[PDB]
Write an enzyme that holds these catalytic residues in place. Structure first.
Site, PDB file in Angstrom:
ATOM      1  N   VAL A 292      43.812 -30.944  56.797  1.00  0.00           N
ATOM      2  CA  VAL A 292      43.742 -31.030  58.257  1.00  0.00           C
ATOM      3  C   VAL A 292      43.354 -32.425  58.740  1.00  0.00           C
ATOM      4  CG1 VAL A 292      43.344 -28.594  58.662  1.00  0.00           C
ATOM      5  CG2 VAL A 292      41.409 -30.065  58.119  1.00  0.00           C
TER       6      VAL A 292
ATOM      7  N   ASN B 277      42.844 -36.913  57.331  1.00  0.00           N
ATOM      8  CA  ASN B 277      42.963 -37.932  56.299  1.00  0.00           C
ATOM      9  C   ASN B 277      42.703 -39.301  56.912  1.00  0.00           C
ATOM     10  OD1 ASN B 277      43.347 -39.024  53.778  1.00  0.00           O
ATOM     11  ND2 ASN B 277      45.558 -38.636  53.679  1.00  0.00           N
ATOM     12  N   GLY B 278      41.913 -40.110  56.212  1.00  0.00           N
ATOM     13  CA  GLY B 278      41.586 -41.459  56.629  1.00  0.00           C
ATOM     14  C   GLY B 278      41.014 -42.224  55.456  1.00  0.00           C
TER      15      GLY B 278
ATOM     16  N   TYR C  49      38.204 -42.684  54.647  1.00  0.00           N
ATOM     17  CA  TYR C  49      36.994 -42.037  54.146  1.00  0.00           C
ATOM     18  C   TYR C  49      37.272 -41.000  53.063  1.00  0.00           C
ATOM     19  CZ  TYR C  49      38.664 -38.225  57.039  1.00  0.00           C
ATOM     20  OH  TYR C  49      39.452 -37.252  57.611  1.00  0.00           O
ATOM     21  N   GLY C  50      38.426 -40.356  53.112  1.00  0.00           N
ATOM     22  CA  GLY C  50      38.760 -39.232  52.259  1.00  0.00           C
ATOM     23  C   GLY C  50      39.655 -38.248  53.001  1.00  0.00           C
TER      24      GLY C  50
ATOM     25  N   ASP D  29      26.866 -44.472  66.109  1.00  0.00           N
ATOM     26  CA  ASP D  29      28.333 -44.530  66.140  1.00  0.00           C
ATOM     27  C   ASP D  29      28.922 -43.471  67.066  1.00  0.00           C
ATOM     28  OD1 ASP D  29      30.856 -45.650  65.548  1.00  0.00           O
ATOM     29  OD2 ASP D  29      31.094 -44.397  63.743  1.00  0.00           O
TER      30      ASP D  29
END
Lengths: 300, 17
Positions: free
Chosen positions: A21, A23-24, A26-27, A143
């Site tokens: 669902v 994805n980037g 980061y993982g 952030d």
């Protein structure tokens, strides 16, 4: 009580992945279900490395302490999937599933990339409740942005991403680590790059909330056509950002004015911000959440 | 920016130019 990654177990018989669902860099994020109970979870998968260890532990330690608040996505537990000698292992972070996605996504999928004002007020109020919980516990998020505000399929609002958050030990305490996402950063945080004396505190989260409200109203943060290096030059020097359109209510304009006070010692604190009419007066919450849920479902 | 990294900051998140 700090997590010890060496004690985490393989998730062999406890959770199963269902669909991918997100994805980037980061993982991955997966929709998952507990194999024994069937309950729904999001599972963030990152491979393990000493190089990202400090942020991982800070995420887990912050979640264990604070994620029980209803405006923070809840942490359920963690595992490490064990892979054979040539292959990295992977950490699985098991969280409350937020099926509507991010506020950034909601804006992208909306005609004109602009939410209704009453939607913005509801989301901003929910974010502030989360910030209030955190600030009262000597936590600075650091952030805040639309990408880190998620929505459930019932239009509940949840803060995520605690990897660079700060845990202070005294109420009056201050920080100076140059960290954040450029367009949303407060002028007193940016100042720490060139000024080894500068400090900031929890009010920097309130600047970022102001930028996120503008993101919801106009589709992007201010200066979104500047290169990040030029945005970082201009945020401390430009006058405080304002909403472009005069069609917004005086209430909304007043709220943006309160968040985006450049002098941070004169910026109002979280409690005072909670009492602003834009946030305090929402007698149609029931109707607003229904409209948000229906709009979310329309946009798929 | 989207991908621009400056020192210790996160990815730009919004831009480039």
């Amino acid at each position: 009580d700090e997590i010890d990654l060496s004690a985490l177990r393989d998730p062999a018989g406890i959770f199963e992945l269902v669909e991918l669902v997100g994805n980037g860099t980061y993982g991955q994020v997966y929709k998952g279900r507990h194999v024994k109970t069937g309950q729904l979870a999001a599972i963030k998968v990152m491979d393990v490395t000493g190089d990202e260890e400090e942020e991982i532990k800070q995420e887990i330690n912050m979640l264990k302490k604070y994620s029980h608040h209803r405006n923070i996505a809840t942490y359920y537990g963690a595992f490490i999937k064990k892979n054979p000698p040539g292959m990295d292992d992977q950490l699985w972070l098991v969280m409350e599933f937020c099926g509507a996605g991010s506020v950034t996504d909601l804006i992208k999928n909306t005609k004109g990339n602009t939410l209704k004002e009453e939607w913005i007020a509801y989301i901003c109020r929910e974010i502030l409740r989360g910030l209030s919980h955190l600030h009262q516990h000597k936590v600075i998020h650091r952030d805040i942005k639309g990408q880190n505000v998620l929505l459930t399929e019932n239009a509940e609002v949840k803060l995520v991403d605690f990897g660079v958050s700060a845990q202070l030990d005294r109420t009056v305490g201050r920080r100076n680590t140059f960290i954040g996402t450029p367009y949303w950063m407060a002028p007193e945080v940016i100042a720490c790059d060139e000024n080894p004396d500068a400090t900031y505190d929890f009010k920097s989260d309130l600047w970022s909330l102001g930028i996120t409200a503008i993101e919801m109203a106009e589709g992007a943060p201010p200066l979104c056509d500047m290169h990040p290096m030029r945005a970082l030059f201009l945020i401390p020097r430009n006058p405080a950002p304002r909403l472009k359109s005069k069609k917004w209510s005086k209430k909304f304009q007043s709220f943006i004015e309160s968040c985006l006070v450049k002098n941070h010692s004169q910026r109002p604190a979280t409690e005072q911000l909670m009492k602003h009419p834009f946030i305090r007066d929402q007698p149609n919450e029931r109707q607003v959440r229904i409209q948000l849920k229906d709009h979310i479902d329309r946009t798929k | 920016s989207w991908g621009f990294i400056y020192k210790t900051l996160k990815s730009s998140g919004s831009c480039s130019c």
